[PDB]
Design a protein around this ligand. Structure first.
Ligand SMILES: C[SH](C)C[C@H]1O[C@@H](n2cnc3c(N)ncnc32)[C@H](O)[C@@H]1O
Ligand SMILES: C[SH](C)C[C@H]1O[C@@H](n2cnc3c(N)ncnc32)[C@H](O)[C@@H]1O
Lengths: 61, 56, 56, 61
């Protein structure tokens, strides 16, 4: 019915140590992309200061 | 398409987006893997249809 | 976070996400610029509040 | 209110040449980031074949 499906999720009370780990988040995000059956094109992860992580995984059909 | 994540460790919060294209890709499988990794104990998810055929 | 775009030239459709943080950053300015740049004639926009203060 | 504001948008009947121009799209996405008042952290744009453009501008502050 649509070209794509999009989930907008709010995660609360997460493991604060995991949230501030740029390495772990990158691993889990990529593994998450594998689980979905998508093809990873590229990915970029940034570690904010003093805390915070941002990560994007560009995928394709 | 993309899977994105933005964390606020100081609040134990994470804004996640799972935008996939095609029948071969399930965004909920990604959601499940992340829910476990981040050890979230409370979640709210809204599913949007992007590019509805009856619109494009 | 992030500003994303996924286009489908075949259908003249673009899936746009404008996710900004803080009060001094306005995503609607980005929307205004892209609408003009892409020459979109019809749009549908849903605004989400990520990390609502009373939720976290 | 909230940590962030997120516009989930559907653009219809766009200029099809522009949608398939990866260089132009990157230029316009960076400008939009600038117009919103956001700082550009990273940028990455992919040109799909036979047609299509995916792009991401990680921002902040
Ligand atoms: C990952 S992000 C979207 C949010 C996390 O990054 C930290 N941070 C660091 N510098 C900035 C900034 N200039 N703008 C926004 N957030 C900032 C936040 O505190 C949060 O942990
Ligand atoms: C940018 S995308 C999400 C959509 C555009 O890319 C073209 N395309 C080409 N190959 C693929 C693929 N393997 N997966 C997803 N899209 C593909 C689409 O036709 C659309 O223009």
């Amino acid at each position: 019915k649509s070209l794509g499906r999009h989930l907008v999720a709010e995660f609360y009370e997460c493991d604060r140590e995991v949230l501030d780990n740029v390495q772990l988040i990158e691993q889990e995000m990529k593994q998450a992309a594998y689980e979905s059956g998508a093809t990873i094109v590229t990915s970029t992860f940034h570690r904010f200061l003093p805390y915070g992580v941002s990560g994007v995984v560009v995928i394709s059909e | 398409x993309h899977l994105t994540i933005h964390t606020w460790p100081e609040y134990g919060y994470a804004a996640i987006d799972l935008f996939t294209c095609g029948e071969d890709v399930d965004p909920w499988k990604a959601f499940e893997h992340l829910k476990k990794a981040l050890k979230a104990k409370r979640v709210h998810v809204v599913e949007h249809e992007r590019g509805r055929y009856d619109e494009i």
